[PDB]
Write a protein that binds this DNA or RNA. Structure first.
Ligand SMILES: [Mg+2]
Ligand SMILES: [Mg+2]
Ligand SMILES: [Mg+2]
Ligand SMILES: [Mg+2]
Ligand SMILES: [Mg+2]
Ligand SMILES: [Mg+2]
Ligand SMILES: [Mg+2]
Ligand SMILES: [Mg+2]
Ligand SMILES: [Mg+2]
Ligand SMILES: [Mg+2]
Ligand SMILES: [Mg+2]
Ligand SMILES: [Mg+2]
Ligand SMILES: [Mg+2]
Ligand SMILES: [Mg+2]
Ligand SMILES: [Mg+2]
Ligand SMILES: [Mg+2]
Ligand SMILES: [Mg+2]
Ligand SMILES: [Mg+2]
Ligand SMILES: [Mg+2]
Ligand SMILES: [Mg+2]
Ligand SMILES: [Mg+2]
Ligand SMILES: [Mg+2]
Ligand SMILES: [Mg+2]
Ligand SMILES: [Mg+2]
Ligand SMILES: [Mg+2]
Ligand SMILES: [Mg+2]
Ligand SMILES: [Mg+2]
Ligand SMILES: [Mg+2]
Ligand SMILES: [Mg+2]
Ligand SMILES: [Mg+2]
Ligand SMILES: [Mg+2]
Ligand SMILES: [Mg+2]
Ligand SMILES: [Mg+2]
Lengths: 80, 205, 82, 85
RNA sequence: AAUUGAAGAGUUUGAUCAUGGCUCAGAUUGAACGCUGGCGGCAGGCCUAACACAUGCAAGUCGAACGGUAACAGGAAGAAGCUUGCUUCUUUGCUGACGAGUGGCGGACGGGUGAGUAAUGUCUGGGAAACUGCCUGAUGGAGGGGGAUAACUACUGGAAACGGUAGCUAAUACCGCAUAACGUCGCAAGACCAAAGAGGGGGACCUUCGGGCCUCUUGCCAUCGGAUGUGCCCAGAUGGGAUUAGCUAGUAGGUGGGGUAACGGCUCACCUAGGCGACGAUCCCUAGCUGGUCUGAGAGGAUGACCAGCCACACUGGAACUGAGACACGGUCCAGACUCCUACGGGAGGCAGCAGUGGGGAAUAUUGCACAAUGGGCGCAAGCCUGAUGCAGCCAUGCCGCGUGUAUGAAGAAGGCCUUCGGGUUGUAAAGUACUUUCAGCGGGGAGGAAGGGAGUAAAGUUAAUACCUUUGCUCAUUGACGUUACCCGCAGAAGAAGCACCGGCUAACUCCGUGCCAGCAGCCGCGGUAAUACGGAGGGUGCAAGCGUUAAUCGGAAUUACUGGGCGUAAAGCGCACGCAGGCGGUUUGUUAAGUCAGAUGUGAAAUCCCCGGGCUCAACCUGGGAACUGCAUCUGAUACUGGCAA
């Protein structure tokens, strides 16, 4: 792997059109408090397999679509 | 650029001899010094801290005959340099050529010592330097140009030069009319009656 | 093709060149790839006046760079080994 | 507009017509192939391919379709024909 | 050694403390105006109308690709000017050369601008699916044919722009044919693709005396690399507004066809019904982004000229063609707006290149010189081109330097000014006296920016070679726009060279006369109605100086949007009260995780700038060496106290 991303699922309901939430904390660049800056990513998962609520590992591939530059690697947990 | 105006007037307002008629007579009088720098000079200038602060730097300025602009840059350079800003300021001021020409005696007053500089009648380490603000450094060697040597002025110049307390930081002939800026004058040389920290304050806010 | 040439960062009447490796198509004082020397032609006989990291110049001419005409002189004027 | 390389203008037309004809004739021979695939004729399909292969490869060499453009076409066609040929 | 640096004042009140705005001292400017104006160095110079443009110039070059001669230069069998060696025309392209044409390479660079663009952008850090002219490594290629055509000749239409016929001809133009692997398709077997010559010198030998032949150079074809350039994808960051809360049908995804140099809803067909959105979509408004620039002790605030990087645009809208590269700044085509030419039928053009013009404005320069340098195009070269550039001209617009004189000069003149008339002041100031001559003027001399290229010659690399070619010496004759250059010497005579604002308090500097709530002043307070230090003039003084004031503008002081660093009983401020979604926060224990946090390593954070230490221009501004710094971002590996996640 050249880096990997984790994140929860958020949306499985679409022929491989899987989108994943990623969560970082970051120091507010002005008032120093730490807030939640979320990222959604449109990831590929051949033969649809993850489900809403799954934690999942993900990696940056080339463009699979205007939107998709990431496939999944592994799954982790279910039935949240 | 040069002051050019009746020059005792200054010493009188500044209340002290700035040695601007330097020449012959000493401890002024034969002038009027003090009790009427103008038409109301007679009066007591009970004056703000700003004023005493103002007049000090003015005094220092009317002395080396330096105009505001240049003096500011002196201050700024002084402050840039590590060391007491006020000392550093006094250092730079002395480092002036024209000054280190009157100080070696070749010229009656700094004004005269200057006319010499501008009139290409001086040579540092051999070469002719006709700009009054040429900063002089340790070990330097300021001479008089052979052309126009022992000419008028420069005699009486090197004369009463010995009447004066007389430097230390600089050794200097008198026959050749050459002389060597040996070191950067220390605080303790020169001064007494000048108050840096005031003219540091004038330029601090 | 890339080239070794003099940029003129002088100052009216007292030129002082940087010597740079860059896309020959760019401006004489524009984007470059890396700096590889300098050349003060008013050097004065005092000290310095034409420092020149040869072992880089080398590298690029290996990678296909052409050299100016002036620079070519300087290199064959630095002598080379002494 | 008045400057020597008016010449260039009139030049790029000579070029343009040249490439225009060879560029069409080429896509014709290419068409003849996809025609047979839509038809069903596996033989005419190969027959078409074998006469267009050189002229593509060839055009590329000459440089109005430089490299891989040809490739794709062969690759594509080849798949198609023996997909059911 | 290298950010080691922070100040307050005036003004509400009779007075006070608090609260709180207003104002002021400071830095900064691509500035303008008013008065004034001596010289030089560096720099800056349409901020407005991305308004419109007369004229010149801003891109060509190669005869060592090609047929070539029209110009001028020579030469030539031979015809001659004849004044028998000096030479004239018919002609002849014979070569030096070269208009026009074909061809090659460059016109995608350099230079202009900030319109559009809140993201095909920019900055940071990364990723995989691609092409890449010239330059460069490697390995082989480079056979043998064919039909054209511009030029030109003849005829011919137009005022012009520029055309119509018919021929006629060369090549590095063009096309077959061969050849075909470490290339392309293909699991394989197999199938399939290319090219161009041109010079330089040369022993036999000899040829149709043109050359073969030898020989070196240079270009040409193919494949894989490099180098550089460019295309593309992801994430974060990069203005404002809810008096905009919903947005979306190629929309989101899949499958296949097509397409691109390349991944891809890029496109299509068909299927799924998705995709975005309060962590602010959509809509609206404004805007090129960066490095950095100004300010501030910092944190911030403000800003994006001049220098460098990226993007974007080239009269307006739209298109593609050529090409390695363009959807092309001085290319093409269509539409539009607008302008020019005309013989009235038709043509032509785009300054946001340089200069210049009109227009707008408070305001922003010469229709200059030169390729000498550096850099770029082409050429083997010599060279040609280069408003890039290097210089010059204009403006105190700014920065920096310098000068306009230096010493001496008293009972201290004259005049002015104040005065209790005693005197004070202007004032060592003037005059007088000695002295100096920078700068400007004048006259002499005279660096550097110059490397190289040209011939010779010498050796070496080659080769048949001592020829050519390339490389390295040697000598000789040379090459500067700036330029009356820098700098140097002499010449004359203080000779040509001082102004502007201020003086009630803040705030450095006081009197008189005039005026009388008038004329007027004023940054704030506030001055003016008979003694005005505040109006106007004068004497004197203070402040700055070839500048000085005024206006405009940013930040500062303002802890007056308070993150650092503030407040809400009565001064601005607790919603009339409650319940509660989202959101924020959350007792106590153990285990686990390693996201927040912390540590280290690596890479990256362009150069310039800033700063420290030096170096070079007589100093300085300016120029430059080298460090330091860029407080950031990412990757990897670790640490587990705190926070977050999971468990109990
Ligand atoms: Mg000055
Ligand atoms: Mg396909
Ligand atoms: Mg009151
Ligand atoms: Mg005037
Ligand atoms: Mg020609
Ligand atoms: Mg705009
Ligand atoms: Mg060809
Ligand atoms: Mg073949
Ligand atoms: Mg052939
Ligand atoms: Mg597809
Ligand atoms: Mg502050
Ligand atoms: Mg410009
Ligand atoms: Mg267009
Ligand atoms: Mg093309
Ligand atoms: Mg134009
Ligand atoms: Mg113009
Ligand atoms: Mg006007
Ligand atoms: Mg120019
Ligand atoms: Mg009198
Ligand atoms: Mg002179
Ligand atoms: Mg020279
Ligand atoms: Mg020299
Ligand atoms: Mg006062
Ligand atoms: Mg006034
Ligand atoms: Mg009165
Ligand atoms: Mg503040
Ligand atoms: Mg408060
Ligand atoms: Mg209240
Ligand atoms: Mg209440
Ligand atoms: Mg706890
Ligand atoms: Mg840097
Ligand atoms: Mg120095
Ligand atoms: Mg815990």
């Amino acid at each position: 792997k050249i880096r990997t991303l984790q994140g929860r699922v958020v949306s499985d309901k679409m022929e491989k059109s899987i989108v994943v939430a990623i969560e970082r904390f970051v120091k507010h660049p002005i008032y120093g408090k730490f807030i939640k800056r979320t990222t959604k990513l449109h990831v590929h998962d051949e033969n649809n397999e993850c489900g809403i609520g799954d934690v999942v590992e993900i990696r940056e591939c080339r463009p699979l679509s205007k939107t998709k530059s990431w496939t999944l690697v592994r799954v982790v947990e279910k039935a949240v | 650029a040069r002051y050019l105006g009746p020059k005792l007037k200054l010493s009188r307002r500044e209340g002290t001899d700035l040695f601007l008629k330097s020449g012959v007579r000493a401890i002024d009088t034969k002038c009027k010094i003090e009790q009427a720098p103008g038409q109301h000079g007679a009066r007591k200038p009970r004056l703000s801290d700003y004023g005493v602060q103002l007049r000090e730097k003015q005094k220092v300025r009317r002395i080396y005959g330096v105009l505001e602009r240049q003096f500011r840059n002196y201050y700024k350079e002084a402050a840039r340099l590590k060391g007491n800003t006020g000392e550093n300021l006094l250092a730079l001021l002395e480092g002036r050529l024209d000054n280190v020409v009157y100080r070696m005696g070749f010229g009656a007053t700094r004004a005269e010592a200057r006319q010499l500089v501008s009139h290409k009648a001086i040579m540092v380490n051999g070469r002719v330097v006709n700009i009054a603000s040429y900063q002089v450094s340790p070990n330097d060697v300021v001479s008089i140009r052979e052309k126009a040597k022992k000419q008028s002025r420069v005699k009486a110049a090197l004369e009463l030069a010995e009447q004066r307390e007389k430097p230390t930081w600089l050794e200097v002939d008198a026959g050749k009319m050459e002389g060597t800026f040996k070191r950067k004058p220390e605080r303790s040389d020169l001064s007494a009656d000048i108050n840096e920290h005031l003219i540091v304050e004038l330029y601090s806010k | 093709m890339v080239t070794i040439r003099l940029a003129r960062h002088g100052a009216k009447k007292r030129p002082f060149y940087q010597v740079v490796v860059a896309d020959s198509r760019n401006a004489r004082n524009g984007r470059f790839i890396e700096r590889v020397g300098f050349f003060n032609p008013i050097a004065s006989e005092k000290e310095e006046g034409t420092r020149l990291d040869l072992d880089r110049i080398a590298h690029w001419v290996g990678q296909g760079a052409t050299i100016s005409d002036r620079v070519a002189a300087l290199i064959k004027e630095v002598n080379k080994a002494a | 507009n008045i400057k020597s390389a008016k010449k260039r203008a009139i030049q790029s037309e000579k070029a343009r017509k040249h490439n225009a004809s060879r560029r069409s004739m080429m896509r014709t021979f290419i068409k003849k192939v996809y025609a047979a695939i839509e038809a069903g004729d596996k033989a005419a399909a190969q027959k078409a391919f074998n006469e267009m292969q050189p002229i593509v490869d060839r055009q590329a060499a000459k440089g109005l379709i430089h490299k891989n453009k040809a490739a794709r076409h062969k690759a594509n066609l080849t798949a198609q024909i023996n997909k059911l040929a």
